[PDB]
Amino acid sequence: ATSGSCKGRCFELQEVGPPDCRCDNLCKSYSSCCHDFDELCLKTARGWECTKDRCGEVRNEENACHCSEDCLSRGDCCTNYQVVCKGESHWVDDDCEEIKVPECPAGFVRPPLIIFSVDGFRASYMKKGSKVMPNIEKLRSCGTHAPYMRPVYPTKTFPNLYTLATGLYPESHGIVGNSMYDPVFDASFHLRGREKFNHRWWGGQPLWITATKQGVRAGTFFWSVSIPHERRILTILQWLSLPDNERPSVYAFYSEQPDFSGHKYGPFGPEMTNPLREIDKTVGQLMDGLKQLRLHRCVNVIFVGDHGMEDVTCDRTEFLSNYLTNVDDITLVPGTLGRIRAKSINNSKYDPKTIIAALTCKKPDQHFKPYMKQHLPKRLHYANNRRIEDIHLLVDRRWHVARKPLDVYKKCFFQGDHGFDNKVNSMQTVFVGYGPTFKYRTKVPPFENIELYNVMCDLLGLKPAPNNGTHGSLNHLLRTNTFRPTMPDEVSRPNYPGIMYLQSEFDLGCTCDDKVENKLEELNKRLHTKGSTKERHLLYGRPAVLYRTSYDILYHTDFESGYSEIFLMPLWTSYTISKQAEVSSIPEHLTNCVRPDVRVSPGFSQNCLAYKNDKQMSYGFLFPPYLSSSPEAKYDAFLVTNMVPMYPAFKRVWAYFQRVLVKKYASERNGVNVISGPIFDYNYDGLRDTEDEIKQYVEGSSIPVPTHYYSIITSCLDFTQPADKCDGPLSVSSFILPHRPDNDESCNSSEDESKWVEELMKMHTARVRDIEHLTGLDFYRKTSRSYSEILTLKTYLHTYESEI
Ligand SMILES: *[C@@H]1O[C@H](CO)[C@@H](O[C@@H]2O[C@H](CO)[C@@H](O[C@@H]3O[C@H](CO[C@H]4O[C@H](CO)[C@@H](O)[C@H](O[C@H]5O[C@H](CO)[C@@H](O)[C@H](O)[C@@H]5O[C@H]5O[C@H](CO)[C@@H](O)[C@H](O)[C@@H]5O)[C@@H]4O)[C@@H](O)[C@H](O[C@H]4O[C@H](CO)[C@@H](O)[C@H](O)[C@@H]4O)[C@@H]3O)[C@H](O)[C@H]2NC(C)=O)[C@H](O)[C@H]1NC(C)=O
Ligand SMILES: O=C(NC1CCCCC1)OC[C@@H]1C[C@@H]2CCN1C[C@@H]2C#CC#C[C@@H]1CN2CC[C@@H]1C[C@@H]2COC(=O)NC1CCCCC1
Ligand SMILES: [Ca+2]
Ligand code: NA
Ligand code: NA
Ligand SMILES: [Zn+2]
Numbered sequence: 001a002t003s004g005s006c007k008g009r010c011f012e013l014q015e016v017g018p019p020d021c022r023c024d025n026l027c028k029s030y031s032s033c034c035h036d037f038d039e040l041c042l043k044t045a046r047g048w049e050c051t052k053d054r055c056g057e058v059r060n061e062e063n064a065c066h067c068s069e070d071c072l073s074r075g076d077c078c079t080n081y082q083v084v085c086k087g088e089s090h091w092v093d094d095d096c097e098e099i100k101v102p103e104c105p106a107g108f109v110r111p112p113l114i115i116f117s118v119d120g121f122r123a124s125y126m127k128k129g130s131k132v133m134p135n136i137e138k139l140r141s142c143g144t145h146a147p148y149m150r151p152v153y154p155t156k157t158f159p160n161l162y163t164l165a166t167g168l169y170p171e172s173h174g175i176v177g178n179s180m181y182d183p184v185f186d187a188s189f190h191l192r193g194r195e196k197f198n199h200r201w202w203g204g205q206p207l208w209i210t211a212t213k214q215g216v217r218a219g220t221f222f223w224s225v226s227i228p229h230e231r232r233i234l235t236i237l238q239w240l241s242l243p244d245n246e247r248p249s250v251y252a253f254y255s256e257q258p259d260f261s262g263h264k265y266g267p268f269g270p271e272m273t274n275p276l277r278e279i280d281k282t283v284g285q286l287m288d289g290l291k292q293l294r295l296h297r298c299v300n301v302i303f304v305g306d307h308g309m310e311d312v313t314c315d316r317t318e319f320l321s322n323y324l325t326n327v328d329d330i331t332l333v334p335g336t337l338g339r340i341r342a343k344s345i346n347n348s349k350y351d352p353k354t355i356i357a358a359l360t361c362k363k364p365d366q367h368f369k370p371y372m373k374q375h376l377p378k379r380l381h382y383a384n385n386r387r388i389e390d391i392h393l394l395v396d397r398r399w400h401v402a403r404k405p406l407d408v409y410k411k412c413f414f415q416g417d418h419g420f421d422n423k424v425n426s427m428q429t430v431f432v433g434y435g436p437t438f439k440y441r442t443k444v445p446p447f448e449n450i451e452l453y454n455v456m457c458d459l460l461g462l463k464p465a466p467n468n469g470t471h472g473s474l475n476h477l478l479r480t481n482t483f484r485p486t487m488p489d490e491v492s493r494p495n496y497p498g499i500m501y502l503q504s505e506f507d508l509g510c511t512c513d514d515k516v517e518n519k520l521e522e523l524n525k526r527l528h529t530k531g532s533t534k535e536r537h538l539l540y541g542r543p544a545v546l547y548r549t550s551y552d553i554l555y556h557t558d559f560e561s562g563y564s565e566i567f568l569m570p571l572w573t574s575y576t577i578s579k580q581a582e583v584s585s586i587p588e589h590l591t592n593c594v595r596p597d598v599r600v601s602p603g604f605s606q607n608c609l610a611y612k613n614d615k616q617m618s619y620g621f622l623f624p625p626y627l628s629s630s631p632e633a634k635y636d637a638f639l640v641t642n643m644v645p646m647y648p649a650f651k652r653v654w655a656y657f658q659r660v661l662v663k664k665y666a667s668e669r670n671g672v673n674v675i676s677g678p679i680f681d682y683n684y685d686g687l688r689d690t691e692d693e694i695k696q697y698v699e700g701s702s703i704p705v706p707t708h709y710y711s712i713i714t715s716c717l718d719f720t721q722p723a724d725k726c727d728g729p730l731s732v733s734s735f736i737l738p739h740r741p742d743n744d745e746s747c748n749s750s751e752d753e754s755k756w757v758e759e760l761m762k763m764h765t766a767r768v769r770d771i772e773h774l775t776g777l778d779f780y781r782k783t784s785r786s787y788s789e790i791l792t793l794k795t796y797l798h799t800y801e802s803e804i
Helices: 037-041 081-085 134-142 157-166 207-213 229-239 259-265 270-292 352-359 405-409 449-459 521-530 608-613 633-638 648-669 757-763 768-775 787-795
Strands: 113-119 180-182 187-189 250-258 300-305 317-319 330-333 337-342 368-372 391-395 400-402 431-434 551-555 560-564 569-577 618-621 643-646 672-679 708-716 730-738
Touching: 081 270, 113 157, 113 270, 113 449, 134 270, 134 300, 134 431, 157 207, 157 449, 207 250, 207 449, 229 250, 229 270, 250 259, 250 270, 259 270, 270 300, 300 449, 317 405, 352 368, 352 391, 391 400, 400 405, 521 551, 569 643, 569 648, 618 648, 643 648, 648 672, 648 708, 648 730, 648 757, 672 768, 708 768, 730 757, 730 768, 768 787
Parallel strands: 113 250, 113 300, 317 400
Antiparallel strands: 180 187, 300 431, 330 337, 337 391, 368 391, 551 560, 560 569, 569 672, 618 643, 672 708, 708 730
């Protein structure tokens, strides 16, 4: 019923309720604009730039923008008015000058924030397109910038833009792809279409809502595609001239480019130079406009992309029809990732287990890997949502998967795409922050886009809703307004047991050839059990236990552990391996040795009988016997308190890691400190399980089986200092290995471990923060480093990609 009028209402900030017609920046998308929207709100007469002959002109309300004398006071000049008509310079031509304080017009309560988001803007464009982007290159070199920013998985538009707005992983905000089926709604969601407009798809609390609830006004962030970029900028500039009580403090501009073109031409197509020139020109208009309003040293500007773009063509498509015979009983969400479910729920013959088996390592060159979603690398955080299908296909970069060849030619067209694993270099995108609140000429290390919501909240004095960022981890981007995080309080204190049990009290069915057994060396043994070498093996203090539980600290010559009396195994084991340390073998006579620990009761210990009786399950050790400091220290590594349950298929991975890789890293990094332990995440929510969530135990026992094993390997960033004598910043790499009864994930697994184990571990790289969530532990509690710096270390991901 669109018979009302947009007179005095163009780009109104609250949308009026149907069936009265709308004049907001979204009305075109709902086909609901008033009849005179175009005429009044979308003026194009005379274009977007003042020329010499328009200077001082008589206001003509029909023009797109104005060059008349009164346009400044009306706030609707063309962005280049002062340059063409008042002999002013373009913002880009001015030297940069540090903005030490905001320089805002009277009546501004805080520096406004403008988010300039660019679709498909790959990180390497900053260097490779630099010659054609002078405005963006100035923002970058004068402000604060990262070499790149990591998107979330899938590296698609919708999941990423909503992550930027909410600080949440897609699994938690609910936008888990560009397309989705929700079985509870029984409803679908598509990028094109009208179902995306329904609010039930959208979880968490995005920045515009956070702002409004806390009394900070927001511009409407979303723009109908047909509103030209120049008009989007002019609207933002007009809103910024509104009276104090109506003027928003936060705005977004959005560009469909360079993504639109990247799909057609590939990331580096020669056609790609023009779209980059044009985005830059848009940035130029914004900054020229701000400089006219005297706001160019007042506004914080963020220039931020959602994902990169990779070379992908028709001929690089794998087909599920070349693998499966029941192809018609499945529905595939296709392309740069795959999600598979049953075509129909009344068909009880469809079986996920046999689907995965049919797609596993079937061709020597296979360009995708099938996964049950709970087995995907935990760093992707891509499982805990009913909209994510049980079966997922991780697709190689540069490839697609499709169901049938017909789907690809009857449903080439494209040379670029994205969606791949968020560790892939081509998927990385950009971040620049410019303004009074950001640092001056400062480079910062790469970080994840989940972190930005907190910083945007900080920029606006807002308290962020609960999110997946680690607040404080990006304080180094900011001149001021930092948020001063504090360490979580330890919840459980440890017990420190001494010798309390005699060996004969234990009936564990365990045996060791150790009775083949002096106040020189017994005086030594006693010190080692009280913590005399603890300074060596626990470098950053004990991890804090952030939940209620019962555990013991156990000291040894070569290692220290936090032993859970509830889970019957360590929550963590800490040890340092110097560059000079030697690897030894496990002597023949000690092959099956397991020794009772006289500090811990029989009832709180594992037993060997359970393993003997459990045909599927074996056991491994957290501190490795291979790295013992001496033949006598080696007996400690065989304590029942150092033992953990491991599938034999997993033992192969773990033994190679402990025998070969630990020593390799100590060699390369000049010593390493290792913390290892189990993870239980049976409901795949990325958070430590309570005992009543455990779905598997060693047969006949109360010994819970971990879903994963982690290690955190820390050393000195300046590797001329040894790990145990480091004066400055730390360096860390970590992993969360899935504890699986087979090695089907590794197609090369029947070859020697030196050909596949390390590749598996790299796939399963993790942030310390991911391990924290999964264990309820807090690491690096006692260092000489600032807490903000430690938060940054905890969010670091070692990616094993070459250098961008
Ligand atoms: C990443 O960061 C987020 C945010 O901090 C973390 O997610 C939070 O996790 C906590 C702890 O588990 C959740 O607490 C539980 O809350 C529910 C009530 O939840 C409702 O209210 C909140 C608050 O407004 C909403 O955000 C919730 O929204 C969810 O559901 C709607 C659909 O209804 C949807 O629009 C959203 O996308 C969102 O979905 C996601 O979360 C749900 C689970 O909550 C999940 O099923 C889904 O797959 C999505 O991932 C919602 O409207 C409450 O019922 C629970 O109490 C129960 O457990 C207690 C034990 O304490 C029992 O005593 C009791 O009997 C209850 O059964 C929880 O307290 C919180 O909801 C959640 N927030 C969000 C936004 O997801 C992640 O954990 C972080 N991830 C990592 C890896 O760290
Ligand atoms: O133009 C912009 N600017 C961006 C700047 C950077 C931040 C995000 C937006 O984006 C281009 C958009 C993004 C999406 C993909 C491509 N293209 C169309 C798509 C869509 C849509 C779209 C839409 C409409 C706008 N609001 C409201 C109406 C629908 C749905 C949506 C979501 O609204 C709530 O989130 N409210 C809820 C959320 C949870 C709290 C309670 C209220
Ligand atoms: Ca869990
Ligand atoms: Na034995
Ligand atoms: Na066994
Ligand atoms: Zn795209």
